[PDB]
């Protein structure tokens, strides 16, 4: 039942040669090609080369460490539920929040605008600095 006993296959380039093979079960013709592999090396062709590689270990690096579209689909999901979040914002703005305070009317924000320009509030860099007091218009 438990399989942490026998050492387990795990193909990765950090430990590029795992201790255990991929397909431990070996058929009759597979045993024949294995004993031919144990024999002289001058009579082996490409298809049995690649099949013996693929039957002893699973993958090769030049086809496993490939950049897939997993980053594409996860950033798509991230900004997709960002879209659902914006829908939640629409729902709660429509139903949960009440009226704005009267302190945000255009005439009223003009009132405080003239107020802190008359006060020269943070006039060095912040707000009154971008305003001219000679021609009475923004710099």
């Amino acid at each position: 039942s438990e399989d942490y006993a026998f050492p387990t296959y795990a193909d990765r380039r950090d430990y590029p040669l795992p201790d255990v093979a991929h397909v431990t079960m070996l058929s009759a013709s597979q045993k024949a090609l294995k004993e031919k592999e144990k024999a002289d090396w001058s009579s082996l062709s490409r298809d049995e080369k690649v099949q013996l590689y693929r039957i002893q270990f699973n993958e090769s690096f030049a086809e496993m460490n490939r950049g897939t579209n997993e980053w594409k689909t996860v950033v798509g999901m991230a900004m997709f539920f960002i879209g659902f979040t914006a829908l939640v914002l629409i729902w709660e703005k429509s139903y949960v929040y009440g009226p704005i305070p009267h302190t945000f009317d255009r005439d009223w924000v003009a009132m405080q605008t003239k107020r802190m320009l008359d006060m020269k509030a943070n006039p060095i860099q912040g707000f009154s600095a971008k305003w001219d007091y000679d021609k009475n218009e923004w710099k």
Binding site: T68, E70, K72, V75, G76, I82, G83, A110
Partner: protein, 48 residues
């Protein structure tokens, strides 16, 4: 032979158009008062 070959680009395109549409909706269509900076184009008028 996976999910990310074609469903991945379908999801990214659909989520792209959906999210940009709903965020332009939240930014513009409701018209919530952001209290933007009144520098440049917003003008005051006199008060007592």
């Amino acid at each position: 032979p996976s999910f990310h070959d074609k469903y991945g680009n379908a999801i990214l395109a659909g989520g792209a158009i959906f999210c940009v549409s709903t965020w332009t909706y939240t930014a513009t269509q409701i018209g919530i008062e952001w209290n933007m900076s009144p520098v440049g184009r917003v003008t005051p008028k006199e008060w007592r």
